[PDB]
Amino acid sequence: MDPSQYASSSSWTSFLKSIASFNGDLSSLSAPPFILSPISLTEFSQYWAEHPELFLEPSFINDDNYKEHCLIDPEVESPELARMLAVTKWFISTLKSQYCSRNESLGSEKKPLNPFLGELFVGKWENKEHPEFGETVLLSEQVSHHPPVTAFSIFNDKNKVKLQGYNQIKASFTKSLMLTVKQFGHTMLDIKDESYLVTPPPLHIEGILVASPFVELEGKSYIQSSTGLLCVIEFSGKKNSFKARIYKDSKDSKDKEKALYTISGQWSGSSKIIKANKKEESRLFYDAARIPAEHLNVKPLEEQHPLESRKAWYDVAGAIKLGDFNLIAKTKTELEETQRELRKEEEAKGISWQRRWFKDFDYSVTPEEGALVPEKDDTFLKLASALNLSTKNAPSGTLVGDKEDRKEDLSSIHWRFQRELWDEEKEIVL
Amino acid sequence: MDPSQYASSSSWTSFLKSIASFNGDLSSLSAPPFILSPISLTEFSQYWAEHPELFLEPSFINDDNYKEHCLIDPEVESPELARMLAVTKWFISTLKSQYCSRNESLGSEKKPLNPFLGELFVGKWENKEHPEFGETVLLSEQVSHHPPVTAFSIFNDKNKVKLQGYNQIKASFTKSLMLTVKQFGHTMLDIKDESYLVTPPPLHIEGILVASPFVELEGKSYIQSSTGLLCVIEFSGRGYFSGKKNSFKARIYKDSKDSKDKEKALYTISGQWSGSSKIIKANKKEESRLFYDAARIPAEHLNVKPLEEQHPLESRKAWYDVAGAIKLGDFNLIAKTKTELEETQRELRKEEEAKGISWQRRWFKDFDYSVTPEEGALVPEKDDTFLKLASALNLSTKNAPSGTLVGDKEDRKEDLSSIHWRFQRELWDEEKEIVL
Numbered sequence: 001m002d003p004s005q006y007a008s009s010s011s012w013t014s015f016l017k018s019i020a021s022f023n024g025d026l027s028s029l030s031a032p033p034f035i036l037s038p039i040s041l042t043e044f045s046q047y048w049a050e051h052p053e054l055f056l057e058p059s060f061i062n063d064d065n066y067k068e069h070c071l072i073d074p075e076v077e078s079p080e081l082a083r084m085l086a087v088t089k090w091f092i093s094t095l096k097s098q099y100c101s102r103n104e105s106l107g108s109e110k111k112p113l114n115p116f117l118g119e120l121f122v123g124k125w126e127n128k129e130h131p132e133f134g135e136t137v138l139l140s141e142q143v144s145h146h147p148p149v150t151a152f153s154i155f156n157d158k159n160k161v162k163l164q165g166y167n168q169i170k171a172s173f174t175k176s177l178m179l180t181v182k183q184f185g186h187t188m189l190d191i192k193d194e195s196y197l198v199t200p201p202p203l204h205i206e207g208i209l210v211a212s213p214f215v216e217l218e219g220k221s222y223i224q225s226s227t228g229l230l231c232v233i234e235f236s237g238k239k240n241s242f243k244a245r246i247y248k249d250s251k252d253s254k255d256k257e258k259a260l261y262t263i264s265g266q267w268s269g270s271s272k273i274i275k276a277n278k279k280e281e282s283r284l285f286y287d288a289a290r291i292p293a294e295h296l297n298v299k300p301l302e303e304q305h306p307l308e309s310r311k312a313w314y315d316v317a318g319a320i321k322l323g324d325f326n327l328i329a330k331t332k333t334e335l336e337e338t339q340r341e342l343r344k345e346e347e348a349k350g351i352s353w354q355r356r357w358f359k360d361f362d363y364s365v366t367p368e369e370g371a372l373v374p375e376k377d378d379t380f381l382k383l384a385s386a387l388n389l390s391t392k393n394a395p396s397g398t399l400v401g402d403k404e405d406r407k408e409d410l411s412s413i414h415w416r417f418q419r420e421l422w423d424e425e426k427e428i429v430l
Numbered sequence: 431m432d433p434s435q436y437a438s439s440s441s442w443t444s445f446l447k448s449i450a451s452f453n454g455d456l457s458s459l460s461a462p463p464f465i466l467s468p469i470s471l472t473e474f475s476q477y478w479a480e481h482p483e484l485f486l487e488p489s490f491i492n493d494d495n496y497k498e499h500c501l502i503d504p505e506v507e508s509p510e511l512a513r514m515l516a517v518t519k520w521f522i523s524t525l526k527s528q529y530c531s532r533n534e535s536l537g538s539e540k541k542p543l544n545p546f547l548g549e550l551f552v553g554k555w556e557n558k559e560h561p562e563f564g565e566t567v568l569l570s571e572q573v574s575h576h577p578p579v580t581a582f583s584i585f586n587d588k589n590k591v592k593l594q595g596y597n598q599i600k601a602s603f604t605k606s607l608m609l610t611v612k613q614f615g616h617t618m619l620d621i622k623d624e625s626y627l628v629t630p631p632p633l634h635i636e637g638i639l640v641a642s643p644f645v646e647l648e649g650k651s652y653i654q655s656s657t658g659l660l661c662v663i664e665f666s667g668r669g670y671f672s673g674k675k676n677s678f679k680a681r682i683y684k685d686s687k688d689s690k691d692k693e694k695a696l697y698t699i700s701g702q703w704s705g706s707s708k709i710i711k712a713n714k715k716e717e718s719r720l721f722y723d724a725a726r727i728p729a730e731h732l733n734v735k736p737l738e739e740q741h742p743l744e745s746r747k748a749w750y751d752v753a754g755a756i757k758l759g760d761f762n763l764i765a766k767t768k769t770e771l772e773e774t775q776r777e778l779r780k781e782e783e784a785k786g787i788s789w790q791r792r793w794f795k796d797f798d799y800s801v802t803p804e805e806g807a808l809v810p811e812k813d814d815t816f817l818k819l820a821s822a823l824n825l826s827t828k829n830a831p832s833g834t835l836v837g838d839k840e841d842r843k844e845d846l847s848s849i850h851w852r853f854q855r856e857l858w859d860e861e862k863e864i865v866l
C-alpha cells in the first residue's frame with residue numbers, strides 16, 4: 001500500500017489497539033510488514049563513525065599545530081580545548097546517522113530486527129581517498145538477548161583512535177502512544193592517551209498514531225574528558241534542536257555563564273557556535289547537510305560467516321521485503337534452528353561465542369567472588385568520578401544521588417572490549 | 431578542506447573572478463576540484479523514473495478500476511482524470527531526483543562532467559519485487575557536444591509505458607553570480623494510446639558566492655494530455671530564511687483555455703516537492719488530503735552493469751579515470767585523465783566508423799519541425815504527437831526555452847530553428863554492440 005494509506009488501514013488500526021494496553025515484550029509484538037525494518041540492531045553500532053574525518057580529527061591535533069586545527073577559533077586557548085571541540089563536532093555528526101537513517105532509507109523509523117545472542121556485525125572504513133587516515137574497523141556483538149544488549153568497538157590503529165561502548169534500552173508507551181525510550185550504557189573514546197566518556201540521551205518515538213514514526217531526542221548527553229573539560233549537550237524539540245556547552249571543568253557546568261563555548265542549532269541540520277558571551281559573533285559549527293555519511297565496507301553475503309548479521313537474517317529480510325506474515329514466521333523459526341546448531345559447533349571448538357570479543361566487568365564497590373573486576377587506573381572510573389556520574393546500571397547520564405542511582409538492588413556490570421580476543425579470532429574476518 | 435573553508439579559499443576567490451572574465455561556456459571555467467562531480471550529465475536521464483511504481487501506475491488505471499486507483503479522490507470523475515492525477519504525482523516525484531540528488535550525495539550541487547559526443551548511459555529497473563511491472567529500460571545518449579544535448583528514452587514493454595525526451599540549457603551569470611539556467615527541450619510520456627507532454631522549468635543556481643551551490647526552480651512546467659486535460663505547475667523559492675524551499679502549486683484544468691482562469695481548476699496541489707504536498711478538489715479548500723510525501727518512498731536506482739562489462743562508449747567506464755582523479759581532488763591528474771579520454775574517444779569513433787556503426791545519431795534522430803524544413807532534413811510524420819499536444823497547449827514548436835507559448839517574446843526570436851530529437855526504437859532493437 002501507499003504510505004498515505006497506512007494510518008487508516010485495518011492493519012494499522014489493529015496494531016494501535018495492540019499497543020493501547022501493551023504488556024510484555026515489544027520485540028516480540030507482531031506488527032504489519034510495512035513497519036518492519038530489515039536491519040538488525042547489531043548494525044546500529046556503525047552510526048558512531050560514518051564521518052571518518054571527524055572521528056579521526058582529534059588525533060591530528062597536537063601542541064605544535066592546534067591553532068591550525070580549530071576552524072571556528074584559530075585563537076583557541078589550548079590543544080585540549082581544540083580536541084574537545086573536535087570530539088563535540090564528531091559527537092554531533094553521529095546523531096543524524098543514529099536517529100535519522102531509517103527515515104531516509106525505509107521512509108520512517110521502523111521496528112528493527114531483534115538480534116540473536118552471539119550475532120556479530122563487522123566491517124571497515126577503508127579511507128582509500130585519505131591514506132593518512134588508515135583503515136578503521138567496526139566490531140559489533142550481541143552480548144545479551146534477555147534483555148537485548150549490543151557491545152561494540154571502532155578502532156583506527158594508525159592514529160591510535162579507539163572507541164568502545166555498549167547499549168541497551170527500556171521502553172514503554174505513554175497514554176498518547178509515544179514510545180518512551182531510556183538508553184543505558186556508555187561509550188569511551190581514546191585519542192592516543194587522552195580519553196572521553198560519552199553518554200547517549202533519552203528519546204521518544206513520535207508519529208506512531210499516524211504510522212510515520214520518528215525519533216525525538218530529549219534530556220542530556222555528556223562528554224567528559226580526562227583533561228577535565230566537559231561538554232553538556234541538551235536536546236529539545238525548531239525540530240531536532242540542541243544546545244551544547246563546553247566547560248573548563250565539570251564543577252563549572254552548574255553555571256552556563258562559565259561556558260567557554262555555546263553551540264546551538266539542529267543536529268540534523270546546521271548549528272552555530274559562540275565563544276564566551278560574544279553573541280554577536282557566531283560562526284557555523286556543523287552542517288549535517290553538507291557532509292554525506294560514508295558507509296562502511298561490509299563483505300559480500302557469500303563471504304560472511306553464519307553468525308554475521310546480514311547473512312543470518314537474509315531469509316527473514318526477504319520474507320519482510322515481500323510481506324508474507326507466514327514466511328516471516330517460518331524464516332524466524334529457521335534462524336532459531338540454524339543458530340541453535342551453530343552454537344553447539346562454536347562450543348565444540350572452545351569458542352566463548354557469548355562473550356566473543358567483550359567481557360562483562362563488575363564495578364560494584366564489593367564485587368562477587370569470581371567476577372571480573374576493573375584494573376587499577378580504570379578509565380571509566382576516573383571519568384565517571386570527574387563527571388559525578390553513577391557507575392551503576394542506571395539510565396545513561398544518571399548522576400550520583402539521582403533516583404536511579406540511589407537504588408540498592410542495582411548492579412554495576414559493564415561490557416568491555418578485549419582487543420586480544422579479536423586479535424586471536426579464528427573464524428570471522430573483514 | 432572542510433566546506434566551511436571553501437568560500438574564503440584562494441581557489442574559490444580565483445574561481446569567482448573567472449566568472450566575470452567568463453566568456454565561452456561552463457566547461458571552460460576550470461573550477462576547483464572540490465566543486466566537481468564525478469557524474470556525467472548523460473546519467474541525469476535516470477531521474478525521470480526513480481519511482482518505478484509511479485512511472486507505471488497510469489497504465490494500471492482503466493474504465494473498470496479507475497475509482498480504486500485514485501487515492502486522493504475515490505469519486506474522481508473519469509479514468510482520464512485519474513490518469514492525469516497519477517502522471518502529475520509521477521512528475522512531482524521526479525523533482526527531488528532531478529534537483530536534489532547531488533546535494534544529498536556530494537553535499538552541494540556541483541559541476542557535472544560535460545559528456546562527450548556519442549557517450550551512452552544504459553541500465554534497467556528490473557522491478558524483481560513486482561512481476562506485473564516488468565523491466566523498465568533507460569537509454570541515454572549524448573547527441574550533441576557543441577552545445578551539450580542529452581536525449582533519452584525510458585520504456586516498459588510489458589505495460590506499454592514509454593517516455594522520450596531531450597534536454598539542453600543556456601546559462602548566464604548575473605553581476606551577483608547567480609547562474610540563470612533556461613532549460614530547452616521536452617519529454618513525451620505515452621501510456622498505451624494516451625499521451626502527455628511535459629516541459630521542464632527554468633531555474634537558478636544560488637549559493638555560488640558562499641560556495642554551497644543549490645538549485646532553485648522558478649517559472650512553470652506543463653503537462654498537456656491528449657485527453658485535453660492540462661496541469662500547470664508553478665515553482666517558488668518563497669520562505670528561504672524561514673528554511674522553506676522547493677515549493678510549488680499545481681493546478682489541473684479541463685483544457686488549456688480554462689487554464690487562463692485559476693478558479694476553473696479541477697484540483698489544486700500545493701506544498702514542497704522535496705517534502706509533502708496536499709490536494710484540494712474544486713474550492714473545497716477547508717479540506718485537503720496528502721498528495722505526495724517525498725520523504726516516505728526512497729528513490730530506486732537503476733541497475734547498471736559492472737564496470738568491467740561496459741563498452742568504452744558507456745559513461746561510467748569512459749569517465750572512470752577522470753572520476754577517480756576528482757575523488758582524490760588531484761588537479762593535475764584530472765586534466766591529464768581528461769586529455770586521455772579525448773584521445774580514447776577519438777580513436778574509438780574511427781573504429782565505430784570502420785565497422786559501419788552509426789555512433790553520433792545512434793538511437794535518436796533530429797527532426798525539423800519548421801514550416802519550411804532545411805533541404806534533406808527528416809520531417810515529422812502525419813499525426814505527430816508533439817504537434818498535436820503542442821497545439822492543445824498553444825506551445826511554441828520552436829527551439830525556445832521549454833514552456834514558451836506561441837506569441838511569447840522568445841517565440842519571436844529571429845531565425846530560431848525547430849529541430850527536436852526523437853527516439854527510434856528500431857535502432858535500439860538493431861543495436862550492434864551495447865547491451866543491458
Ligand SMILES: CCC(=O)OC[C@H](C)CC[C@H]1O[C@H]2C[C@H]3[C@@H]4CC=C5C[C@@H](O)CC[C@]5(C)[C@H]4CC[C@]3(C)[C@H]2[C@@H]1C
Nearest residue numbers: 026029031044098099109110111167179181205208213
Ligand atoms: C512493534 C514495534 C513497535 O512497538 O512500535 C514500532 C514503532 C512503530 C517503532 C519503535 C522502534 O523504533 C526504533 C528506534 C530505535 C532506536 C533508534 C536509535 C538508537 C541508537 C543506537 O545507538 C542504540 C539503539 C537506539 C536507541 C534504537 C533502539 C530501538 C528503537 C527505540 C526502536 C523501537 C523499538
Ligand SMILES: CCC(=O)OC[C@H](C)CC[C@H]1O[C@H]2C[C@H]3[C@@H]4CC=C5C[C@@H](O)CC[C@]5(C)[C@H]4CC[C@]3(C)[C@H]2[C@@H]1C
Nearest residue numbers: 456459461474528529539540541542597599611635643
Ligand atoms: C563551472 C562551474 C560553474 O560555472 O558554476 C559552478 C556552479 C557552482 C554549479 C553550476 C552547475 O550546477 C549544475 C546543475 C545542473 C542541472 C541540474 C539538473 C538538471 C535536470 C536534468 O533533467 C537536465 C540537466 C539539468 C538542467 C542540469 C544542467 C547542468 C546544471 C545547471 C549544472 C551547472 C553547470
